[PDB]
Structure 1
């Protein structure tokens, strides 16, 4: 019962997935190939995966939407977040990208209305030090 965030285009990573997947009896290769197929269909960004386990060692993968932080990074065009959030601003986002990510978080989340996800993403941008406009 573990969850991870991992790059879409490559399987069998060294740091994150290897050991944690190993200590849980999950078959590494079958998960790698299925995730690679799904993420080649996706081809947008890295994807987070949750690992659910059974007594018969069968494994089920839970694939959510692309991470909100990464979506805000691609919307702001920058790669690395601001080292001093609210103290230096690296980029600015208009409400179109914020609302697209808000629809994404609506699809992935418990939010009743798109406004809730919009304010969630505005808070994420505040955390990064990225202005929402």
Structure 2
């Protein structure tokens, strides 16, 4: 089993996903209409390796590992944590942590904020 994260504009791209045993048009249409509200953006998908493989695919909300750049109003995710790239208000960071609290091992907003700080460590900008 592998992890995948691709554009939400269309599920047609991806030959590895179509070769699992699921019809191309099937997941293409299904994903494109399940993201019809908001598409044309990067979304992380998850699927399993099943034998029948009719449809065992689901999506997840927008990844938050370098997504703080969206909150930081900048791009070009830094390789090294040597200098800071910008500032993010703590209110937005905590609101996003709560927004992703249910997803992960974090059980309170504080633990999700700790994980946000941990993934922001590499970026060079911390929870400020």
TM-score range (shorter-chain normalised) is 0.7 to 0.9
Greater fraction of residues in helix: 1
The reply to whether residue 68 of structure 1 matches residue 58 of structure 2 is no
Q: 1:56 aligns with which of 52, 57, 68?
A: 52
Structure 1: 5+ residue runs without aligned partners? none
The structure 1 segments of at least 4 consecutive aligned residues displaced by more than 2 Å after TM superposition are: 10-13, 42-45, 52-57
- How far did residue 100 of structure 1 move? 2.0
- Equivalent residue pairs, number: 128
Greater fraction of residues in strand: 1
1:23, 1:5 → 2: CA distance? 17
Contact 1:52 1:59 in 2 (8 A): no
| TM, length-normalised to structure 2 | 0.85
Query: Relative to 1, partners in 2 of residues 1:131 and 1:94: Cα closer, same or farther, differing over 3 Å?
Result: same
Query: Relative to 1, partners in 2 of residues 1:44 and 1:22: Cα closer, same or farther, differing over 3 Å?
Result: closer
| TM, length-normalised to structure 1 | 0.82
Query: Which residue does the alignment assign to 1:120?
Result: 115
- How far did residue 44 of structure 1 move? 8.4
Local SS of the residue matching 1:118: helix
Query: How big is the alpha-carbon RMSD for the aligned residues of Structure 1 and Structure 2?
Result: 2.0
After superposing the two structures, state which structure 1 stretch, 25-34 or 115-124, moved more.
25-34
